[PDB]
């Protein structure tokens, strides 16, 4: 027979061979979900939504040189690419606020803040916004294994002047490139590996690949992946003015007939990565999924800083094979077109030899580049392409490419496998998954390619759900000025006819941290909450529903005090039995336990129905007060108020012994 | 004979299960050999 020792082993071998191939797939090919993204970009763009708007206009972020950075703009510009020490370009994208920092918020003294490279401060602000954008309380990440992978390089800050006398050494850890991530991990409390790589403008995708490796292996929970590039000296412009590599007008003309140089910009960009299974087990928000990645080197070429074709084709094929896909499951590819008269044809020909090769005919493959809108970021270009891809996937449209009025004649465009984006093309979801890919080719040799996809089918149509019951809105900030700032923000948020009051209350209560200065408004309707926040932002508290204060100790020891007799009034909790179920349940259980020993119901006396005694006789007053106090204590404990001691004045000691557990409800009724 | 049929399937499960687990060990716990080393150090040590 089966002996159930040979056929019972079969059921536990054929159900292990299946948690092995599947475990193998989890080990090597686990997709990584993207949770949230943050960015500081030139031209006043400090939010992804403004970035998307700027992308759909087909606008420009080209301005003049900064004036408040201490530069010498009258002894710098020269219309001749000779006379070294001078630059022949007068354009360029720059940040509007690069010298701003909130020192007291992060606990940094003014002098230490004045001794920082602005890249670190911008990274701190961007990381805080990135954490808050995911609907995650930033105080819940303390002690968790979260990695910080960054791409950042030194540009020269305070290194031309003599160092001031700071015995504590504030001028080394501020400008060092290895503290840009350690400082984030120290000020935020993360417990994971922190690495600051160098890949010569392909650093962001290298950090992303390392984060994917770490997440798949299992040594990290979340990853903060990004890059930063904020100038402090005009040296880059001067140096590249000597090689005549800069564009005359400062515009990057990607894949256009006339490209004659690149143009630089400043920016900080960060994204948050997590495993998809843990992302939808915890209930987070998924924007896109990274499927596979590939890295290689240009190798032996005709120059140290010269591109090659076969290396690009090989890295493209490695990126395709590592996830189990083929060339043709693609809608659009993000390219690295910097306006290089020499690199653009090479990259395009590499793209037509894999993707436009023998391709389906009823569309070409869409080719675009983001560098024609904002310019070269030189440290966060790949992650900028990642943000562009995520925005296109979320909003369902492919933005156009500028300066492609006709294409360069050095790319064989007649094949029909690759066509440039000369307009906005619909990218709505249908029968086929919508995938696309980003490509960053560094100058030191390391080339990379990443394949993004759309997020699985999901429902989020449950936010709109409101009741007529009161809602508490609680705001908190480190300073009073910030308190009114946040109050005004929330008040102007509650103006629009589609802002759910319950949703806003839940988001404030759950997805925001708690700080020293606090305020709260309990509102039954919508204009009442508006007016309460109006007063809070107005710098006063006179109304009835507004309660505000400040705390310095983050937790208390609660003691319950039960007073004696003499504080009753006809109609205690007349509605609370109808609006709160715990109160009614506790009163009702007390009522059954007291039923054998009296002929009247406690709720009957509380609700003033006819046929019940008044509250002038002691023998009815005392049990009613006992029931009211015990129900109120249980209602207090149902909200997360855990007592540590109980005290009773005259006859409240019975209820105190009840709540302490030293007695039961039974002998208490007796 | 129900031993013969249910045993021969359990020897083609002992094979595949070993192969899969051994590939798992290769994936996560492969030792890395060191081949050669070079150094320039102060004091004439090269």
């Amino acid at each position, epitope marked *: 027979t089966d002996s159930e020792k040979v056929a019972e082993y079969l059921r536990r071998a*054929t159900l292990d061979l299946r948690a092995a191939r599947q475990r193998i797939r989890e080990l090597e090919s686990d997709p990584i979900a993207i949770v949230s993204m943050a960015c500081r970009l030139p031209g006043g763009v400090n939010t992804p939504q403004r970035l998307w708007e700027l992308l759909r206009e087909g606008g420009e972020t080209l301005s003049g040189f900064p004036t408040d950075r201490g530069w010498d703009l009258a002894r710098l510009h020269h219309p001749d690419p000779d006379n070294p020490g001078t630059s022949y370009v007068d354009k360029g994208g720059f940040l509007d606020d690069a010298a701003g920092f909130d020192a007291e918020f992060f606990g940094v003294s003014p002098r230490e803040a004045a001794a920082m490279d602005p890249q670190q401060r911008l990274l701190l602000e961007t990381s805080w916004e990135l954490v808050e954008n995911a609907g995650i309380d930033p105080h819940s990440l303390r002690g968790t294994a979260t990695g910080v992978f960054l791409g950042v390089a030194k540009f020269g800050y305070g290194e031309d002047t003599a160092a001031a006398e700071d015995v504590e050494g504030y001028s080394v850890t501020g400008v060092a490139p290895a503290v840009a991530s350690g400082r984030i991990s120290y000020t935020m409390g993360l417990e994971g590996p922190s690495i600051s790589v160098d890949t010569a403008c392909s650093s962001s995708l290298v950090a992303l690949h390392l984060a994917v490796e770490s997440l798949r292996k299992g040594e990290s929970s979340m990853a903060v992946v990004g890059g930063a590039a904020v100038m402090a000296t005009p040296g880059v412009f001067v140096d590249f003015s000597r090689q005549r590599a800069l564009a005359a007008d400062g515009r990057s003309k990607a894949f256009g007939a006339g490209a004659d140089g690149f143009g630089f910009s400043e920016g900080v960009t960060l994204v948050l990565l997590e495993r998809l299974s843990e992302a939808r087990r915890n209930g987070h928000e998924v924007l896109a999924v990274v499927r596979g990645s590939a890295l290689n080197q240009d190798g032996a070429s005709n120059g140290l800083s010269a591109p090659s074709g076969p290396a690009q084709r090989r890295v493209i094929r490695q990126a395709l094979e590592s996830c189990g896909l083929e060339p043709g499951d693609v809608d659009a590819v993000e390219a690295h077109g910097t306006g290089t008269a020499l690199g653009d044809p090479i990259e395009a020909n590499a793209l037509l030899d894999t993707y436009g090769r023998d391709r389906d005919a009823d569309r070409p493959l869409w080719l675009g580049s983001v560098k024609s809108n904002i310019g070269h970021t030189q440290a966060a270009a790949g992650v900028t392409g990642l943000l562009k891809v995520v925005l296109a996937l979320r909003n369902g449209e492919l933005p156009a490419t500028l300066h492609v009025e006709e294409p360069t004649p050095h790319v064989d465009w007649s094949s029909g496998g690759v066509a440039l984006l000369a307009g906005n093309q619909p990218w709505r979801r249908g029968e086929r998954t919508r995938r696309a890919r980003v490509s960053a080719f560094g100058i030191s040799g390391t080339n990379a390619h990443v394949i993004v996809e759309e997020a699985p089918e999901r429902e989020h149509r449950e936010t709109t759900a409101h009741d007529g019951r009161p809602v508490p809105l609680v705001v908190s900030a480190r300073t009073t000025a910030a308190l009114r700032a946040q109050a005004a923000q929330i008040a102007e948020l509650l103006e629009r006819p589609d802002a759910d009051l319950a949703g806003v209350g839940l988001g404030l209560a759950t997805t925001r941290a708690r700080h020293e200065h606090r305020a709260a408004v309990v509102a039954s309707t919508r204009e009442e909450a508006v007016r309460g926040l109006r007063e809070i932002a107005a710098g006063a508290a006179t109304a009835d529903a507004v309660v505000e204060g400040v705390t310095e100790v983050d937790g208390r020891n609660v003691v319950f005090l039960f007073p004696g007799q003499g504080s009753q009034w006809a109609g205690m909790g007349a509605e609370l039995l109808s609006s709160s179920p715990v109160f009614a349940g506790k009163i009702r259980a007390c009522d059954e336990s007291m039923a054998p020993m009296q002929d009247w119901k406690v709720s009957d006396v509380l609700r003033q129905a006819p046929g019940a005694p008044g509250l002038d006789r002691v023998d009815v007053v005392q049990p009613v007060l006992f029931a009211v106090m015990v129900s109120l204590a249980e209602l207090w404990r149902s909200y997360g108020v855990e007592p540590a001691a109980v005290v009773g004045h005259s006859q409240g000691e019975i209820a105190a012994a009840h709540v302490a557990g030293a007695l039961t409800l039974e002998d208490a009724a007796k | 004979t129900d031993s013969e049929k249910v045993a*021969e399937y359990l020897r083609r499960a002992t094979l595949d299960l070993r192969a899969a687990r051994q590939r798992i060990r290769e994936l996560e716990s492969d030792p890395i050999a060191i081949v050669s080393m070079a150094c320039r150090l102060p004091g004439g040590v090269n």
Partner: antibody
Amino acid sequence: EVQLVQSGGGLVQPGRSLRLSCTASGFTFGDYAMSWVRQAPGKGLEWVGFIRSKAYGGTTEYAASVKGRFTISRDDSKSIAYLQMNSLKTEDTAVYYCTRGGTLFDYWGQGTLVTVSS
Amino acid sequence: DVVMTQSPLSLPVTPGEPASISCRSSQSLLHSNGYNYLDWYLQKPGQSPQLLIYLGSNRASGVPDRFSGSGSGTDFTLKISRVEAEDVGVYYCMQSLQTPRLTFGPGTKVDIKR
């Protein structure tokens, strides 16, 4: 994977004997049953017989058209499977495969092509 | 006695398509201890055959990932994901409810479609 090595092909006269030989390397031969599959042109695979491993007996089973004409033996000490054929007919010019396992034909050897010719 | 099994005799499929083979038996073919009493097989032209699928549920070790197998009752399917150059040959569907069997199967011949 493991290797089954097979030999014993050649020219035969219709009505005489011939013995094959199949050795196994990489696995224990004393635990597997062995089946024999003939392959001739104009037809597909055909099971012709199988022998049981030790600890389960030594019973052998054959096909209807070969019962009383062929025999299969084995030696687990020196670990070979032998197929001995008596009174061969001209329609059995074929290549013989030895298959590991009585029912799960998991492995197939390279085979030898032996022919009876008049 | 022996359950009859069959398969389409020939099906040339161009590379790049999710080809499929079926095995429509006459009576129910299932295994109590396992899942189904069925085993798929392959043989390229000119060499020894090989095992692909056992119980009609497992995927053999050493054969590519694109192969698979499903079905129950009297209907089964060998769902292949993609077709390549060395996919030509003959496929066989065998049952193991009672032995010795006699419905060995002519086999499906697969080649390049033109």
